[PDB]
Design a protein around this ligand. Structure first.
Ligand code: ATP
Length: 289
């Protein structure tokens, strides 16, 4: 008896959470987060967690409930926690929907036998892959960094900052857990020089370095995001080698339109037609046979 699982895939910021919520208006469902940074409670802004008002009352799992203090949630920990949630949701007769972009979490969860120390499918999957042209994605991702700063990302990180942390001079790649999130390592470099709340006060040529350091942290964040996007896409392209029937949704014009600070009526129209209507149809057919 192999359970049905909808899987929403795509690089960071391609509108996966959005889509999961729009589909809920058509199908009774519940969401399981598959983004490995979003599993931790904390840095709600920095990690781009979908706001609660925007979840539309949809039930979410594996979203902001792991205590970062307890270390990394390994891919094996995830398989266990999420397989439980898949099982529970189906129990309540709603469709479980895996939403996120950590291909390492998606894979650990979905395979038949997990290769614990790695470094077919356990479920009956439907894969929706939301794709955006790199350039549009890139540009949207830079804009989104600006919206995170405008929302207060910097103050969030200044409050998260702690001199008892021993990884300030280290990249996300080898950091552990929530401290790997894009934005944390970048601003640690800035706070290195300008500790939270520290001011110049009177006559320091220091201003030119403060501005240069801030600016540099911001470009680095946009850049790392852009690079992460590239590695995710290539990675997705490789599962589209291992077979995997990915149903591609082209969100490009939705995003282009979303770039305008007129990101509402126009962006919604396009998305409704180009991304949502097609997904409803695919899921609809997946729920039948
Ligand atoms: N929501 C997020 N906010 C901030 N940074 C993120 C977020 N999601 C991913 N990242 C960054 O990208 C890295 C890889 O996350 P990814 O979603 O691609 O899963 P992954 O497949 O396990 O990647 P990898 O195993 O190569 O580290 C994370 O370690 C983190 O630094």
């Amino acid at each position: 008896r192999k359970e049905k699982l909808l899987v929403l895939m795509g690089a960071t910021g391609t509108g996966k959470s959005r889509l999961s919520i729009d589909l809920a208006a058509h199908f009774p469902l519940e969401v399981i987060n598959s983004d490995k940074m979003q599993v931790y409670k904390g840095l709600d802004i920095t990690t781009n967690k979908i706001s609660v008002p925007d979840r539309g009352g949809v039930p979410h799992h594996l979203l902001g409930e792991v205590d970062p203090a307890r270390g990394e949630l390994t891919p094996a920990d995830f398989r266990s926690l999420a397989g439980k949630a898949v099982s529970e949701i189906t129990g309540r007769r709603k469709l479980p929907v895996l939403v996120g972009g950590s291909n390492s979490f998606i894979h650990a969860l979905l395979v038949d036998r997990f290769d614990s120390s790695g470094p077919e499918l356990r479920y009956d999957c439907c894969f929706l892959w939301v794709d955006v042209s790199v350039k549009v994605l890139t540009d949207y991702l830079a804009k989104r960094v600006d919206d995170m700063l405008e929302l207060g990302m910097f103050d969030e990180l200044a409050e998260f900052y702690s001199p008892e942390d021993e990884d300030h001079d280290e990249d996300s790649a080898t950091r552990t857990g929530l401290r790997k999130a894009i934005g944390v390592p970048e601003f640690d470099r800035y706070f290195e020089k300008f500790r939270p709340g520290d001011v110049e006060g009177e006559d320091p040529g220091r201003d030119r370095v403060r501005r240069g350091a801030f600016e540099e942290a911001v470009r680095a964040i946009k850049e790392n995001t852009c690079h992460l996007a590239k590695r995710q896409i290539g990675k997705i392209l490789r599962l589209k080698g291992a077979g995997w029937d990915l149903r591609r949704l082209d969100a490009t014009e939705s995003f282009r339109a979303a770039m305008t600070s007129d990101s509402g009526e126009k962006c919604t129209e396009i998305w409704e037609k180009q991304v949502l209507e097609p997904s409803v149809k695919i899921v609809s057919r997946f729920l039948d046979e």
